[PDB]
Structures are given as C-alpha cells and as structure tokens.
Amino acid sequence: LFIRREQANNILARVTRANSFLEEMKKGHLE
Amino acid sequence: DSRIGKLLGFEWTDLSSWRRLVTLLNRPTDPASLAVFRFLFGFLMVLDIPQERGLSSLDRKYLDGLDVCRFPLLDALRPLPLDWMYLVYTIMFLGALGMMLGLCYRISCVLFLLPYWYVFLLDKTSWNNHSYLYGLLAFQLTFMDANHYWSVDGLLNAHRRNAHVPLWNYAVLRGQIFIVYFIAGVKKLDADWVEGYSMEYLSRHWLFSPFKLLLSEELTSLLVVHWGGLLLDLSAGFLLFFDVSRSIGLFFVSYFHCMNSQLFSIGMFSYVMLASSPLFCSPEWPRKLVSYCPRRLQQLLPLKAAPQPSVSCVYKRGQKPGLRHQLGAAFTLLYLLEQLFLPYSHFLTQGYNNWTNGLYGYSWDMMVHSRSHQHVKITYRDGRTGELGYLNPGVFTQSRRWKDHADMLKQYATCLSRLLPKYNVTEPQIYFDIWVSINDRFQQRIFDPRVDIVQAAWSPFQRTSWVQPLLMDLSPWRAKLQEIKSSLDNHTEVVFIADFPGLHLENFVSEDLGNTSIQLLQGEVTVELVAEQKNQTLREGEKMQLPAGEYHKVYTTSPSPSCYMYVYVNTTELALEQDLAYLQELKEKVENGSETGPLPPELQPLLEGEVKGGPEPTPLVQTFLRRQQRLQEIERRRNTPFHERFFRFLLRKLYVFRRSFLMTCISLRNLILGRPSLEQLAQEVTYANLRPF
Ligand SMILES: C/C(=C\Cc1c(C)c(O)c2ccccc2c1O)CCC[C@H](C)CCC[C@H](C)CCCC(C)C
Ligand SMILES: *[C@@H]1O[C@H](CO)[C@@H](O[C@@H]2O[C@H](CO)[C@@H](O)[C@H](O)[C@H]2NC(C)=O)[C@H](O)[C@H]1NC(C)=O
Ligand SMILES: *[C@@H]1O[C@H](CO)[C@@H](O[C@@H]2O[C@H](CO)[C@@H](O)[C@H](O)[C@H]2NC(C)=O)[C@H](O)[C@H]1NC(C)=O
C-alpha cells in the first residue's frame, strides 16, 4: 500500500477527467 | 358549490374547529388509484433490489475477513456476516412481493421498511435522493389502507373487498410529491444553475437534436435544460393539482421523466415518478377504465360496483370521531411539516456542513454541483521512529465520497489508525491534501494539510475548524478561463490552481512532461527549484520554464490567495504518435504499390499481422497493432443492429437476476442445514457464476 515520494507529489498526472453527479448508480459489473 | 371550495375540494368552514378537520381528513374516498400505485411501487422495488441495492454484488462488498473501512451514520452499527445479510435481503424481497400483491399488508410493509432502513443507514456512500424517497413512501404506505382494492387480502377477508379509505392517504402522498417538485425547484435557484454551469455538456445528447434546428447549442444548453427544468419543477408541483391544467401537466411531466430516464442512469426514479403522477387524477380512474371493457374481459379484472362502507372513515348522517381518525390527521400534518423543515435543517447539524450543505441524500438538490478532483495525498509519521511515509490515495475503501465530506474523513483516519499497526507503523499521525473544483472553478484545497486528522476535533453540532473556505471571490474569473482553455492546440493541456497565504505546493513533474511552463494570473508567488536551491519571485503575467524530472515548490507570499496555472505537453506521446503515423504511412505506401523497394524485416510482422516463426515485435509494432485492433473493435461495435443490442441487454439482466437467486439459495442453505465441504462450495459458486447464453 505504501507509495514513493515521487509518485505522491505528481499533481500533473493523467486522471479520468469527468464530472460527478452523485445521484447516479455505479456500474457495479465489468468486463 | 362555492367557487373557492370546488377548486380545492373543501369549504373553509371545514377548518373552523378540530372536530371538523378530523371529519375532512377522514372523508370516504374510492381506493382505486391507491391500489394501482401500491402494485406499481411494489413491483418496481422487486425489480430494483437485485440491481441497485446490490444483492448481485453482495458477496464482494461484505466479504468475511477482508478489512475495509465502513462509513455508517452511527459508529455502533456494524454489518452482520454475509449469510445473515442475504437473509435480510430475502426478507426485503418477500416484503416487496407482499406489498405488490397486498397479502398480509401490514406485516409485509414492516418487513420491507426495517431492513431497507438498516441497509440505508449502514453506509453513507450510497445515499441518493431516490433511495430516501423509496424509504419515505414505504413508511407512509405502512399506515395507509391500500389493500382494499385489487388485493389478495380482500379475497381472504370479506370486510376489505372494495372498501372506502380515508382521504388523508391521498393527501399525504400528493403532499410528498409536491414537496419533491417544489423543493427541487427552489433549490435550483442557485447562481450556478440559472447561469448554465451545472449540466453544461448535456446539450450534446442526440435527444436534444430537434431543438438545435431552431436555436444555437449554447441557448439550447441554457434555456431548455436549465430554465426549462426549473420551470417544469415548479409547474409540475402546481399544475397537476387543478383540474383545468392536468392534461398539460401530465404531458410535460411524462416527457420530462422519460428524457431523464434515457439521459441519466438514476435507476427506477423516473418510472416511480411516472407511477406517482396519476395520483393527482380522480380517485376512481381505474374503475371507469375497467367499465369501458368487453364483458368477457371483466371476468378477470377487478370489480366495478360501488365500494362498501368502511369503519376507517367518518360518515355524515352524526358520528363522534374515535381515536384512529385523530391520529391519522395528526400524522398527516406533522409528517408534511417535518418534510418541509428537514431540507432546511442545516443550521443545527453544522458538523456535516462543507462547501455544500449537509450530507447528500435528503435535500432534493439533484444535479446541481459537479466536482472534479486533481490529486489526493495521504502522509503518515510513525510515532516511535519518526519516519515519514506516503500511502495510496484510496486504500481500504470502496467509495470516493470521503474526499468531499469531513465526517467521513475522520472515520477514514480512525480506520487507518486501527489498521496500520499490523504493518509495523506505531501510533501514526495522518495528514490529507485534496484538490477539488466545483462547477469549473480554480482548484483549491478542501482540508488543512497541516492538521493531524487522527487526533483532531469533530462533533456533529459544531463547525469544523480544519475545512478551508471556498474562494467564491474568484467566481467571475471563469469567463476568462474558457478563453484561455479554448486557445490551446490538440496536444497542450492546462491546469488551474488557487492557493491560500502561508501554504505551498510541492510538485514532481514527470520525465515525460517536457516543455512545461508556469504563468501567474493573480497575486504574488515564489517558485523554488530544489536541485540548485534557487527561488525566483514572480509578479503578474510572468512565465517560467520548469524542469522535467525534478521537484519544485511554489510558495504563496501575498496577503490574499494567489491564482496561477500550468501548461504542459506530453513530449513522449507526441514523439510516439509521430513515429506511429510515419509507420502507418509507410504501410499504406507499400499497400498501394508505392515504395517498390523490399520491406524491412521489422515491417514484415505488420503486413503479416501475426508474430509466428520470427523475432518478437518491437514496442512500436505492438502499439500499432494494439491500436489497429482497438479501432477494428470500435468499428464493429458501431456497426451492430438494434436487435442484437436489445438481446444482449436482456441476457445481461437475466444473468444478474440468476446470480442473485443462486447466491441467496446457497446462503440460506448454509444458514439452515450447515456448510458442506470446500469442494462442494467451490463447485456451487462456479455454477452460480455461469453465463446464461
Ligand atoms: C436533470 C434535470 C433535473 C434533475 C431532476 C431529476 C433527474 C429528477 O428525476 C427529478 C424528479 C422529481 C423532481 C425533480 C427532479 C429533478 O430536478 C433536468 C432535465 C431537463 C429535461 C431532460 C429537458 C427537457 C425539459 C422540458 C421537459 C422541455 C419542454 C420544452 C421547452 C422548449 C419549453
Ligand atoms: C504521457 O504520455 C505517456 C505515453 O507513454 C502516457 O503513458 C501511459 O501512461 C500510463 C499511466 O502512467 C502508463 O501505465 C502507460 O504505460 C503509458 N503508456 C505507454 C508507456 O505507452 C502518460 O499517461 C502521459 N501522461 C503523463 C502525465 O505521463
Ligand atoms: C526560497 O524562498 C522560500 C520562501 O520564503 C524560503 O522559505 C521559507 O523558508 C524559511 C527558511 O527555512 C522558513 O523559515 C520559512 O518559514 C519559509 N516560508 C514559508 C512561507 O513557509 C526558502 O528558504 C528560500 N530558499 C533559498 C534557498 O533561499
């Protein structure tokens, strides 16, 4: 679970850009 | 006869005294529409339990032995073992069936109500606005005589076949629906909704295609989606009540709910609201609909005769009201008043207040705030050695709502404090640093990154001292930001930051993000490079070229918050894309006959398409082949007939229901008879996880 200093201070990292409508059921299943 | 008494259904004199208000809320009424709503609601909940409540995926959420952090409303609540949870869900299903068929109604409603609220209170990360509505409707229906019409209990007991019901049942239900619509409308008077920032990108859905034939995209994204939604909420509250304006209201509400069902993935909320809309019609519409049928069909449909007298209503001859009538009237008034008050009760429970108000789930502020997160860091300090370490962002959790809310963050910190000591970390102190933006504002911290959350202070009835205020003074900047964001190329990307005085941001730019620059927009900051221990002070509008592969800090020295931005381009991806494009161009040239010279051996796998009898492909070849396969798969997916998609949808849902049923049966057998050997359990579990086909 522990992570290095470099990986924990990388603000400019590719994230899953999207909005957040909290009133939406999660998918649950996957491929 | 009076005009003012015929548009509201009661003369003013009926409110003069208590004994005449009890005689108005217990007037006889036909039970026809209440039974239809009961049946639809029960059937929808039956469908909903194996899909949204999570009976299908209950064997991976509450698995035994796995150490996870829970977020219950009360710390005393704890999940039972998995088998007893499956028994609880079985009781829910049985209660929902009982409500649907009206068999042992007052026991079935309890059996559905108590488990549902147990599950609802066991986890704070699954509080929508429709789960709360379902719970409230069950609580109301527990006290309503909805089993009088079209119910098996009527067949069993002859005193409940086609019997009158008191008027306050319809009153409570209509009041609940009106409260939903009106409070949603008034909550949507926030400055973000009336200006076009909430649901800005929803206008691109194909269902809004006809509107674009008469309006531009932006006006369709402001006038129709936002103002139309607000006006429809208020009008759906009011119009359905009055007889003159009910057809228009039903049409608009039905169109609104169907579009909501297609656009979003809320679940059964839209269909439940469609079922609830007919409650505002006359109390006997199913009876008149049944009358207009052939004589043959009526042998299966419910009765059409007038309902018989009931002992639950006050009849005008006189009759002194008893005890249940008074309790019914009091329940109606108190419940409606409490429902009005609860959404605006955030000045008492200030612990749950944040940038928004209160925990999500019971305010009817649907689809009003959109949040984007940039980074999350968790740092710990051992209490004995003094060393400093960094944890994964979301370890030991199954939801991502612990970032926005402080009460859940305290529970997360305590859970980590309890779990870490089995990994040799003694007496940890845990710090958090979260970057979140609401409705396209500057990214800013939501919690203080210097406070030990493990041993901080939090009570439900006092304000939290370690939650940063929202910088709403920087709200008007957004109009500029899009202008900056729309002037970039197809490779450049931009990030915006706003930081408080006295705090600094430490950032490690990756080796790939070459050509990265920092530009200041407002305030005064100093940027430090630690490689040579050199810091430069920046004024407004000054740009600096940062390293690629080294730490750098930005300190905010101004008396007021400072706003700056990062502009970066992924050089490695750009080089890879140029090389891949060149390789594809060469392959196309070979295919069309150009480049007559013999292909290189490395190119031979590309034309062949299979690595057989030769050297393993280079990484460039692997990436190109993977992209080709992905493109072909996407093309195949796009070119599929509708009936195949419908068949796959039905098969997936059938799989979900079958898995739910088989797992529940296995759990009940484990409860009653015993637990067989491990091999038999493995074989049964394998049987459960089998695709239907
Ligand atoms: C996402 C929207 C509202 C949020 C919402 C939802 C999802 C609900 O489930 C609600 C249920 C009950 C009470 C309030 C709810 C609620 O607030 C607007 C959706 C906008 C809609 C899809 C666009 C069409 C608007 C009208 C119907 C078009 C009329 C024609 C115009 C040109 C005037
Ligand atoms: C920069 O471009 C690279 C292209 O290599 C992106 O890399 C993928 O990134 C993920 C997440 O780190 C890795 O697991 C993959 O291996 C990368 N793909 C490769 C090497 O082909 C990367 O996400 C982009 N962004 C940043 C911030 O580095
Ligand atoms: C570069 O400037 C920064 C910003 O002032 C300096 O850092 C501060 O550092 C001193 C010395 O350790 C601390 O006492 C202050 O509290 C720091 N300020 C803040 C706001 O935290 C830094 O030392 C400078 N570096 C060099 C090499 O001169």
Tab-separated table of C-alpha atoms in Angstrom, chain A residues 3-13, chain B residues 374-379 388-393 431-433 435 445 449 504-511 513 530 549-554 566:
chain	number	residue	atom	x	y	z
A	3	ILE	CA	3.966	4.580	-2.326
A	4	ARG	CA	7.122	6.542	-3.070
A	5	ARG	CA	7.636	10.258	-2.507
A	6	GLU	CA	7.876	10.966	-6.241
A	7	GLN	CA	4.579	9.284	-7.125
A	8	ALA	CA	2.708	11.026	-4.281
A	9	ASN	CA	3.705	14.583	-5.333
A	10	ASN	CA	2.873	14.254	-9.047
A	11	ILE	CA	-0.023	16.671	-9.485
A	12	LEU	CA	0.221	16.676	-13.300
A	13	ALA	CA	-0.766	13.039	-13.824
B	374	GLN	CA	-6.947	16.697	-9.373
B	375	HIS	CA	-4.884	14.979	-6.669
B	376	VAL	CA	-5.058	13.275	-3.274
B	377	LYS	CA	-2.101	12.641	-0.939
B	378	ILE	CA	-2.006	10.783	2.386
B	379	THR	CA	1.097	11.200	4.556
B	388	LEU	CA	7.646	9.838	7.120
B	389	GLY	CA	5.784	7.757	4.545
B	390	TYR	CA	3.093	8.110	1.896
B	391	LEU	CA	0.063	5.856	1.410
B	392	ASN	CA	-2.045	5.066	-1.627
B	393	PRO	CA	-4.936	7.510	-2.262
B	431	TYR	CA	-2.414	14.272	7.057
B	432	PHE	CA	-4.549	14.839	3.955
B	433	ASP	CA	-4.223	17.161	0.962
B	435	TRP	CA	-7.561	19.286	-4.674
B	445	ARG	CA	-7.546	22.695	-1.025
B	449	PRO	CA	-2.806	19.958	5.087
B	504	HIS	CA	2.993	25.982	-0.530
B	505	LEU	CA	2.530	23.327	-3.215
B	506	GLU	CA	5.318	20.804	-3.832
B	507	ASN	CA	5.168	19.185	-7.267
B	508	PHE	CA	7.230	16.497	-9.013
B	509	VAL	CA	6.771	16.912	-12.760
B	510	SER	CA	7.243	13.622	-14.593
B	511	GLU	CA	10.067	12.993	-17.044
B	513	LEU	CA	6.083	16.267	-19.490
B	530	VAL	CA	15.453	22.366	-5.032
B	549	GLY	CA	12.055	15.318	-13.779
B	550	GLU	CA	12.764	17.295	-10.603
B	551	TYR	CA	10.908	18.676	-7.604
B	552	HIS	CA	9.725	22.270	-7.480
B	553	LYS	CA	7.789	24.244	-4.871
B	554	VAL	CA	5.504	27.265	-5.212
B	566	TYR	CA	0.349	25.095	-15.515
